[PDB]
Every structure is written in structure tokens, then in C-alpha cells.
Design a protein around this motif. Sequence first.
Motif, short mmCIF file in Angstrom:
data_model
loop_
_atom_site.label_atom_id
_atom_site.label_comp_id
_atom_site.label_asym_id
_atom_site.label_seq_id
_atom_site.Cartn_x
_atom_site.Cartn_y
_atom_site.Cartn_z
N UNK B 1 2.42 0.53 9.47
CA UNK B 1 2.65 1.78 8.69
C UNK B 1 1.70 1.87 7.52
N UNK B 2 1.02 0.76 7.26
CA UNK B 2 -0.33 0.84 6.74
C UNK B 2 -1.09 0.91 8.04
N UNK B 3 -0.33 1.03 9.13
CA UNK B 3 -0.91 1.16 10.46
C UNK B 3 -0.74 2.57 11.01
N UNK C 33 -1.70 -5.57 6.10
CA UNK C 33 -1.35 -4.76 4.96
C UNK C 33 0.16 -4.64 4.73
N UNK C 34 0.89 -4.19 5.73
CA UNK C 34 2.34 -4.12 5.65
C UNK C 34 2.94 -5.44 5.20
N UNK C 35 2.52 -6.53 5.81
CA UNK C 35 3.04 -7.84 5.48
C UNK C 35 2.98 -8.20 4.02
N UNK C 37 2.60 -6.26 1.53
CA UNK C 37 3.30 -5.25 0.75
C UNK C 37 4.77 -5.46 0.82
N UNK C 68 -5.01 -1.68 1.10
CA UNK C 68 -3.89 -1.69 0.17
C UNK C 68 -4.34 -1.16 -1.18
N UNK D 265 10.17 -10.06 7.00
CA UNK D 265 8.84 -10.53 7.19
C UNK D 265 8.63 -11.22 8.51
N UNK D 268 7.99 -8.28 11.34
CA UNK D 268 6.56 -8.11 11.42
C UNK D 268 6.02 -9.42 11.96
#
Lengths: 230, 269, 230, 269
Positions: B1-3, C33-35, C37, C68, D265, D268
Motif C-alpha cells: 500500500x506503499x504498493x 516501505x509498508x514494513x 512504516x 517513504x 509485521x 506482511x
Amino acid sequence: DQAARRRAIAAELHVSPTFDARDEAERRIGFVADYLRTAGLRACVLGISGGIDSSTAGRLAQLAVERLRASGYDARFVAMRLPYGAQEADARRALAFVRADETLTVDVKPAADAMLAALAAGGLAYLDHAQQDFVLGNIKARERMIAQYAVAGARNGVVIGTDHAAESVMGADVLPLAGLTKRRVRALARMLGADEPAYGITYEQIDDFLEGKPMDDAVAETVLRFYDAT
Amino acid sequence: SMSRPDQAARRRAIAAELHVSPTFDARDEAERRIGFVADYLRTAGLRACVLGISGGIDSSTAGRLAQLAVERLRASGYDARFVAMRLPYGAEADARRALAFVRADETLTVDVKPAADAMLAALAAGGLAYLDHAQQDFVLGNIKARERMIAQYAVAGARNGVVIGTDHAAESVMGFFTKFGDGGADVLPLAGLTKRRVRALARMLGADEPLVLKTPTADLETLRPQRPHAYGITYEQIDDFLEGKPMDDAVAETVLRFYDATRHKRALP
Amino acid sequence: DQAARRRAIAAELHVSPTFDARDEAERRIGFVADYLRTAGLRACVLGISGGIDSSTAGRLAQLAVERLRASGYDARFVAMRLPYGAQEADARRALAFVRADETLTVDVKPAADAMLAALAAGGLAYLDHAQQDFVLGNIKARERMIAQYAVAGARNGVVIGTDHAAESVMGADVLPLAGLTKRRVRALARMLGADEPAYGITYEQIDDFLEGKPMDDAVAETVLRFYDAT
Amino acid sequence: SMSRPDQAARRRAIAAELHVSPTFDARDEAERRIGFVADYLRTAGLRACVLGISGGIDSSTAGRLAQLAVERLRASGYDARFVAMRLPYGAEADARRALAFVRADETLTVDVKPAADAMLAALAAGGLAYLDHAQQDFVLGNIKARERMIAQYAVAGARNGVVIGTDHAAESVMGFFTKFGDGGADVLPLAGLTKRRVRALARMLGADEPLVLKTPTADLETLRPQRPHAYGITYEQIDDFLEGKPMDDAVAETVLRFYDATRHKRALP
């Protein structure tokens, strides 16, 4: 070293080795609620036969639509009596427990008999009469599903199923009894406030098998046989 | 979703989920769909399979495939038979022609109008009533499709066989839009196929163009929403989507939305 | 009928039967990026050896922290050179490709030699000298991991790993190369813009195996042997 | 999410995830943890296992269990040996006493201070530098724990054995708070256990209370956060949590938060 499968089946069928009724009720009422909300649905639908499984599934669904309405989200639960002709106090008793928003009664005999009749006229023949009865039993069960879909579709709703793990082993759209064993269905109903109404394979034996309850070896072997033999 | 996966990427990916292969060769998809049906039958112990022949190309194709499968089984020595069913709603040219192409071991004609009409009346008796012409149409439509499935299951029951189903990947996507169910079948020889791929399979099996083009009311009714405004997707847009062909972006975005909304409800639990 | 496992391993190891580099890059940059964040992290850390796997993982991570920062979320990528003494232009070449926010160089020989020495003084003995070299090779690899954790911890960050499916078969916290085969790692790097730098089992053979690529029967049997033999 | 599970329910459930059983009997958890270690060794082909003996109760207990496991293996005929390691950071009473209780086939004393100090210096040389007394402490702490793991792996490598690990369920929960890693071991005979359950296992194995009470600096350092304000959870609160014992609601809510943040986490990808 066969105990490998047993545990493999319970997990695949989603049976947890412990159980708290309050906890489960809460969880399953929420499942149903989220489901209808997430999908923009306005109703759900279940045939109420007087059997403990549909009593339980239906009461959870009534509680789900009540929890939604408290939310400001509108939703109704439609209970269905689905007799095969003038055959009935068990379902009325179940109804008095479910306390559904709505109850419709739909007689499935005319549709079922009309299907059987058309099959015959079409040249479908049975070696034995017993075989015709078996064919009719399945027609009846399916006609009952059609009535439920008919209402779910006309109402922008969905059909509740009564599937559970004991059932899968032994024997819709939304399945709030998934993962449960038979005695756990009974216990969930008791705590919701319900009153107190195979080839030799029993529900106790299946429940033990699926539950990890240390049980006799032979028996276990037995249950594993019947399951694989399916 | 930064994807933020590309539409083309999302199409890739859905397509693999549904088993739409990147290339298609009809000659041997035929060969392999046949064998699949056969092997399933032995492996299960079954001796018969059953299918309603609507006059429409998916049933013509699944039908023919089933008749070749049993014809093969026999050769393998393992006896078995295919029962085609004609399932009129009362009083059809399309179906009779399809039957002629399928050339089933056996054909039963079973009228589903009495059962369908009885279910609709009993539903009205029970309170699903005061339906206007279109609401009744739409209700009657589902009932008929599911009564047809009942007929096939009864025969299959009677004969220790299984019901052949016509489901395919393009049909699955259509279902995201319509939500039409009929309850399902046992063995799906057309699985993974798109609409144009079914047509290509049929031509490989010897279907003539007139047969390819037939669209009975029984097939047309299954492309409508549950009740009677609906975004109108066509199978041609669905096929382009799944096959990754150049096409309209807006259209493809719609299809993603619909697949998304479905992907969730399946997540729940 | 063994083809059952092959496909079973690829799925378990997460190898998709098709591959588009652009698509994968995008997906993996977002994972990273998600990780960071989601976990409230401020940095990530990777040893850059000059090998294609760490070049690739590291460039994805640099691109992740850049994505980011464009977001308004602050994060840095710390690249580490981790020599064993004065041994080096391959890593510099890799560095020039990764273009990391930061690069630290940490010599692991003193720690590694001090560990080997203490083991000896402690009475750990080897039948052969070759065996001591093997023991030291593993000490070196582990010292390299310590340096990375040391920096990740001091910086509220995490360590990037280079794990992938070809690697699992043949041979950290965040693994952006998960599911990939060896040739697919190489292709991901090529498209990110990189220049163009066992018991007889090869990466081609493993990549074929894991990729569904129709390949020779024997060979396949071979790869399955080696994997099970582990 | 129209679903609001009770804290007691959430505890149930986490506990099963981590393998904390509802009842605990020490006498036969002992018997079964032993056999487990043994059977793992044969099944793998391995002939040795290794463990750093810190002076602290988890290593004393995992240690003793390992020594009984090999002692058993032998009986089964299948030769094998246990190597205890004393791993001082330079120039300890706790460890020597623990060793006396473990009674390992074999003990190696390996000084990790030279390696630890060399890694810290090289890190400073490389730019992780100008550390204040507490930042250096915290950095040095992780390094030492991981250098100790290196020593055990080297021996294990050398001897075709595996590293016994001390991980347990209470330790896992502590890890949600601290984020302390040491890299892990191969075989975890204490898995599923809470802190008080490890102590009970040890007493069953014959540990005396003084031994039970020992807390070496090497164990204490592992309960600190990565860098030097942190919510202070105790093992006693964690044990109460996992065992479902009456306890403080606020406390239990904190533990849920922390487990939640971790649960993600791991989602993901």
C-alpha cells in the motif's frame, strides 16, 4: 504413527482444541455482522427445521442483525419453515427460541413432487422403489435450498448455512458454525439459552476424533477409515 | 500500500488465480480436458456423468467433451456412460441442434416448468408475493436454473454418476457482477477457460458457426443480476481482461473493483 | 507421479509460474516501505558483498526508503561493507549501483579471529585443518550478521535479508527477495538498472525445478533428491 | 470487528498459539521433553548437542534436559554426547554452580570478551561511534549474546551436533517488548513453557532453590530494550497473562497491544 492425519484433519476443518461458548458466540455473531456489512447486504436467510444446527445458526444470525441495527446499519433475518406437506411442533419450538425478525412458511412438496413426476415422465427409472425414495429425499433437500435462495435474491440478502466440522465429516453462502463439533454446537445453543431439545459412526466418536480428546485407538482408526472412505 | 500494482499486473495475477493460461492451443486443451474427465471418473469409481444441454455453446462444448471422455473410458476398458438432458421450461430449436452435435449415449427430456411454477406459487403463498412483472421474471429465472440442476443431480444420483458443470473463468468473473448461482456441479471440464476459448475449443471439436452462435433464453437469464442500475459488462470485455489484451482502462478498472469486493468476502472469516 | 512434490515445494516456497520484473520491483519496494512504516522503524540495514543478491535486495531497500521520504515518513538505508581484513572492487561496484543513503565499512576479521582463538584456547579441537577453515567460514558469516544487528538496533532499524527460494533450496528480519528464483533475482536487478556483473546441482536446475519450466525427467528427480536430502 | 473478543478470550488463544497448555504437570513434561530431544537427534543423524550455561535457570533446565536426553539415547544404544559451554565475558559464581547441577558429558570454557570487544571497536571504527555509557552498554549487550551463540554453533559445527536453545513462550512475549534477538538455536526443549513452569520443571529435575534464584548479568541484559521510556513488563505479569490467572486489566491490555503490533509485521508480506 497415524495420529498424524487426525490432527491434520482437525486443523484443515478448523477445530480448536479448546472451546468457550461465550467466546465463540461473540465471535460468530461478529462474523455474520461484518459479512453482511462488508458486502452491502440487507438480509440473511435460513430454513428452520427444528434441528439443533439450524436453531443455533439462526439465533446467531438474529443476534447479528440486531447488533447491526444497533450500529445504524439496517438488516433483517428471515427464518423459513419449509415443510414437505402437512406432515411440526419442533420447528415451532425452534422458532420460539430463534425469535427471528420474520418467518415465512413455504411448502416444498408441490415443487418436489412435480420434479419427481417430470423425471418419471421423462423416462428416469429406478431398479427399486427404495431408490426412488432416496432420489426424492435429495430433491426435497434441494427444493428447500431453492426457496432460501429465492428469498435471499429477491431481498438482497444471503443464505446462512449450517455446515460444521462434525457435519462435514459425517454427512450456502455464510457459515457461522464453521469449525465446530457437534457437542460444541449443542453447547453454544445452551449458552445462547436454548432449552434442551452412519455405518455405526456416531457424533461422539467424530467429536472426539476432531477434538483431540484422547480416545480409544481402534475407534479412532475407525473414524479415520470412514472419513478417508469419503 | 506503499504498493500500487499496475492494472496489467493485477490482471496477470487474477488470471493465474483463475487458471487462464498465457497461451492457448485448442487441439490439446481438448485432448487434456477429455482425459481429465475420464480419469476423474475411474479414480472415483463412478460410471456415469450427466449434463443439461441448453442449446448454448458452453453446454454444447462441455457436453461433447463428456461424450468423448466416456467413449475413451470405454476404450480403456472402463465402462461408463454420458447422459445428456434436455430441460425445457414448457413449450426449442437451439437445444435440439446442440444435441445433434453432442451425440450423447443417452438423452432424457425433463420438463422443469411444473416444478419451477410450483416453487414460485408456494413462495408467493408464503409471502414472497405481489411481484411486478420484472421482479417475478427475475425470481423465476433463478428458480428455473436451479430446478435444472436438481434434474441433473437426480439422474446422477440414480445412476451412481456425477453432474458435469459448465463453469469457466470468464463465467466466474461474470458472477462477480451478477451473483447468479445454480449450486454447482461435480466436474468442471471447462475450468480456466474464457468465453472465446470455449468457442475455439468447440470449433476444434467440430462445432459449426451456427451452433457457436446460439444463445438460448436459459443461458441469457444467467447473465442478469439477482433482481431488477447495473453496470453492463460483456463477456468480450471479460475475456479481453483475463487474456491481457489491449482494451479500455475504465472498463478494466471496473472489473478490478468487482473482483476486489469479492476477494474480501471470501477472506471473512 | 512425483511431479506432485515439485509443485508442492514451489508453492510452499512461494514461486509464481509467471514473472514480470517491473511488477515485482514495484511490489517489493512497497513491501519494504509498508514494513518499516507499520512497525514505526527509522532505518534498514544490509551488508553489501558485491554479490547480485545483496545488490538487488539493497537497491530495493534504497528505493523503499526514498518512497517513504516522499511520503513524509523519515527513513534511511544503511549499506555495510564487511570485509575480512584487507582482502574489493566488486563491492564498490555494487555500491555505485545501490546508491545508499549511507555506507559503513566494518572489518570482521578481528572479531572472527578472536572467536576462533578463544575456541582453541578453550580446547575445541579439529581432526583436520580443513575443518578449522570451515568453522572459521561460518564464524565470519555470523560476525557479519552481528555487525548488521548492532547497527539496526542502535538506529531503531531492521536487518534486510537476501533469502529467496532458489537460495533456500540450494544454500534476517525483512526479506524482499522471498519467492524469487535466481534468474529472477538477476532479471530484477537488470531492470532496476544493474550493469551485468552443490554436489553438481546448479541454479539453472533449481530455477527450472521451482519454475515449472518443463525440464528433463532425470534432472528433476535429481533436484528433488538433493532437496529432500536436506 | 462487529466482533469484540474478551481479553480473557484473546489470552486463551494467544496461549494456544504459543503452546502453553491449560494444565501443567512437571513430572511428565520432563519425561516428554527429554524424549523429544533424543528423538530429534536420531531422526536427524546428529551425535551431539551444545548449550551455553549462563548460571540462570532457563539454561540450567534446558541443559539438564539435554544431558538426560543423551544419557537416554545412549541407553537406546544410539551414541551421542552433550557439550555444556561456559562463556564468560572476561573475569562467575552463578555459572559454576549451574554446571555442577547440569553435570554435562563435557564442558568447554570459551572467553567471548576478545571477540565482543573487537566487534564493538570495529563498529566504532566504521562509524557507530561517540556512544555514551548507556548506548555502548546496550550495543555491547547484544553483541555479547550473539558472540555466545557463535561459540555454540562453532562447536556444534565441529561435532556434527545442534545448538540447544532456551526459548519459551514467556520469553517470546518478552521479545514483543524488548525485541532482543540472538539468532536462535536448533532444538527448543523448553518451548511452550512459561517462566514459572520452567522453574517448576527445574525443581522436578532436582534443582535447589538457590539455583532457581540465580540471575546472571548475561540473562538480565536480554530483558532490556534495544537501546536506552520503556514499559516495564515482568515475567511474572507475562506468566499470569499466558496462564490465564487473575491479574491486572491494564497490564493485560498492554500485553495485547504489544502482541498485536507483532502479529501484523509477521502478516506482511
